Amino acid sequence: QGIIPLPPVENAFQEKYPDAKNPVFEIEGNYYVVDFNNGGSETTAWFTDQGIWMMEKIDISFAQLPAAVSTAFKQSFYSNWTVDDTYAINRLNMGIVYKIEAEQSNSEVDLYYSQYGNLIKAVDDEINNDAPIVIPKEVSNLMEITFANAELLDIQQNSLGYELDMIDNQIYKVAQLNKDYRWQSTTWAMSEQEVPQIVMQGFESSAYASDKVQSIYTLLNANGTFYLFKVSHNGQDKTITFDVFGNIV
Amino acid sequence: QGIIPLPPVENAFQEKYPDAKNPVFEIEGNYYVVDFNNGGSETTAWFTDQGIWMMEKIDISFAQLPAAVSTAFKQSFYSNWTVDDTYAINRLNMGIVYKIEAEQSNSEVDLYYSQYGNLIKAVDDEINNDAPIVIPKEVSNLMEITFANAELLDIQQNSLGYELDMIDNQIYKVAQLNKDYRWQSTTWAMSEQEVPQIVMQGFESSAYASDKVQSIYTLLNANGTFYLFKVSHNGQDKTITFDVFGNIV
Ligand SMILES: [Ca+2]
Ligand SMILES: [Ca+2]
Ligand SMILES: [Cl-]
Ligand SMILES: [Cl-]
Ligand SMILES: [Cl-]
Ligand SMILES: [Cl-]
Ligand SMILES: [Cl-]
Ligand SMILES: [Cl-]
Ligand SMILES: [Cl-]
């Protein structure tokens, strides 16, 4: 069953997955897609016409998730929902992404996580919603110049343009690009211990020093570098922005 | 001290405040402004050149606030800040607004509340930032036709147009107008008892039934009437919108 793959596809497939069993190929969009058993795990892999491997999706159990991911889920808005399926997704030149499919009553959500438990996105479940992501030349050029060591996890389209989700020395960084892929901003959560001394002293000498710290983000944009302290009091949240001298802006 | 008011301003002032002591007039923008002792509290009143009364700002103590307002402050993000000043503000053809000025370290905030303790707005304190609000014909017409029972409390400009804050039959409502003052939406908070039964049954049979309800708001716009349930779990918030049929949209 399924179709006969082109020889370069068959060759790339057999070279990458020598232990594959019961492979079944089909054409979906611009890719040769193969469902198969690999070391007892149901796997799907995507290849281009020329046999270039682009992605794999592996069926895993909840117990096979890294601790950081299972903990992220357990601490999430959806922790009480029933987990239906869990997957590991590897795309060409991208870091690993874990997918948890969860349901409750008449709703079903697809949760995508970094290996460190960073929620990349949450979407309504739909069948066949996971496919290859071609990295545009503009994005590879930007990564080489500005984020040389980082590893992309996802490229998402939004109204303002594109979002790059990446891991940079285990930091989950989100960069916004406009519709022409021109960089606009980068933001990430940091630990209080990592905030520069001058900024941290500003915060500790400010009105907000006694408030509960919910999170701290660095924000980089055309205007410079900023530190966003999200603090709370009586269950109300406020985000206070500090500049590089530790002054409130 | 100060300047001599035009005779129509002087007469309007004496007629409206017969017991005023130590009045001092100045001109500020398009208005004659007078500072005076009114029955033991400092008060400021604004008049047009023609002597039309536009506003008064009355110095009050925290104890003179309606209970709802002082309670709103004590439950706010700023409950721990030091109260520097409190005022009651009455503007022509508008309902009463209470202002609380609070400070901590080198920050100061101005909190404006309805008589029921609804936060109208919160802004960084700035000297003499309270001034008359000329109600445009478009807004007066809209209040007469569409919100005939309501008292307007504030008109606030925003990027999408204008925001009208009002009290309509003891419900605090916020209406959004576009830049031509054309109505876009109206929203207000409600209790579960006030929500239509079909909508509550929809929520109670949905995936979000077991989550904690933080608030429920009705939203009216060109496309219909909606119910926004802001719920939480593991400290994470999500707003679920239901239509008049009790279905999630
Ligand atoms: Ca400083
Ligand atoms: Ca229904
Ligand atoms: Cl979440
Ligand atoms: Cl960076
Ligand atoms: Cl420093
Ligand atoms: Cl401060
Ligand atoms: Cl809190
Ligand atoms: Cl209404
Ligand atoms: Cl919660």
DSSP secondary structure code for residue B245 in this structure: T
- Contact of A80 with B232, CB cutoff 8 Å: no
Q: Is A210 on the interface with B (CB under 8 A)?
A: yes
Query: Whole-angstrom distance between the N-terminal and C-terminal Cα of chain A?
Result: 64
Contact (CB<8Å) B107/A209: no
Q: What are phi and psi of B8, to 5 degrees?
A: -70, -35
Q: How far apart are CA A34 and CA A37, in angstroms?
A: 10
Searching chain B, which residue's CA lies closest to the CA of residue A76?
A: B234
What six digits make up the tokens of B181? 């003052």
Residue contact A234–B207, C-beta within 8 A: no
DSSP assignment, residue A4? P
* Exposure b/e, B111-120, CB count within 10 A at least 16 = b: bbbbbebbbb
What is the rounded distance in angstroms from the CA atom of residue B115 to the CA atom of residue B89?
A: 11
Contact A80 B106 (CB under 8 A): no
Q: Over the Cα atoms of chain A, what is R_g?
A: 21
Sheet holding B224-233, edge to edge: B151-158, B161-168, B171-177, B183-189, B212-221, B224-233, B236-242
Q: Is A247 labelled a binding residue?
A: yes
Is B84:B77 a contact under the CB 8 Å cutoff? Answer: no
Q: Rounded distance, CA B155 to CA B139, Å?
A: 9
Resolution in units of Å: 2.0
Question: Which residues have CB under 8 Å from B169's CB, separation 6+?
Answer: B149, B150
Closest alpha carbon within chain A to B122? A238
Query: In degrees rounded to 5, what are phi and psi of residue A74?
Result: -65, -25
Of B87, B167, B163, nearest to B121 (Cα)? B163
Q: Provide the CATH number for the domain formed by A184-249 in this structure.
A: 3.10.450.360
- DSSP secondary structure, A99-162, as one string: EEEEEETTEEEEEEE-TT--EEEEEE--TT--------HHHHHHHHHHSTT-EEEEEEEETTEE
Contacts of B53 (CB under 8 A, 6+ apart): B12, B16, B45, B46, B47, B92
Kindly determine whether residue A248 and residue B205, on different chains, have CB atoms separated by under 8 Å. Answer: no
Residue A147 corresponds to which tokens in the numbers above?
């984020």
A249 touches chain B (CB under 8 A): no
Written as six digits, the tokens of A4 are 């006969």
Residue A218 and residue A241: Cα distance in Å, rounded? 10
Nearest-CA neighbor of B95 among B115, B123, B121? B115
Q: What are the residue ranges of CATH 3.10.450.360 in chain B?
A: 1-183, 184-249
Phi-psi region of B144 (alpha: psi -120 to 50; beta: other; left: phi over 0): alpha
Q: Is B63 left (phi over 0), alpha (psi -120 to 50) or beta?
A: alpha
What protein residues have CB closer than 5 angstroms to ion ligand 3?
A: A 76-77; B 236
Give the strand pairing for A171-177 and B161-168.
unpaired
Helix then strand then coil, in percent of chain A rounded to 5, is: 20, 50, 35
Long-range (24+ apart) CB contacts under 8 A made by A45-51 are A45/A13, A45/A16, A45/A17, A46/A131, A46/A132, A47/A5, A47/A9, A47/A12, A47/A13, A49/A6, A49/A8, A49/A9, A50/A8, A51/A6, A51/A8, A51/A9, A51/A10, A51/A11, A51/A12, A51/A13
Instruction: Catalogue the E-assigned strands of B51-135.
Output: 53-60, 82-91, 97-104, 107-113, 119-124
Both tokens assigned to A207: 């009105």
Q: What experiment produced this structure?
A: X-ray
Give the B window 35-94 contacts with A, CB below 8 Å. Answer: 75-81
Rg (CA), chain B: 21
Parallel/antiparallel/unpaired status of strands B82-91 and B53-60? antiparallel
Question: Tokens 């960089």 correspond to what residue?
Answer: A183
Does the CB of A248 have a partner CB in chain B at under 8 Å?
Answer: yes
Residues with CB in 5 Å of ion ligand 8: B 186
Quote the CA–CA distance of B64 and B59 in Å, as a whole number: 10
Our CA angle for A159, A162, A166, nearest 5°, is 140
Architecture of domain A1-183: Roll (3.10)
User: B207 touching A, CB under 8 A?
Assistant: yes
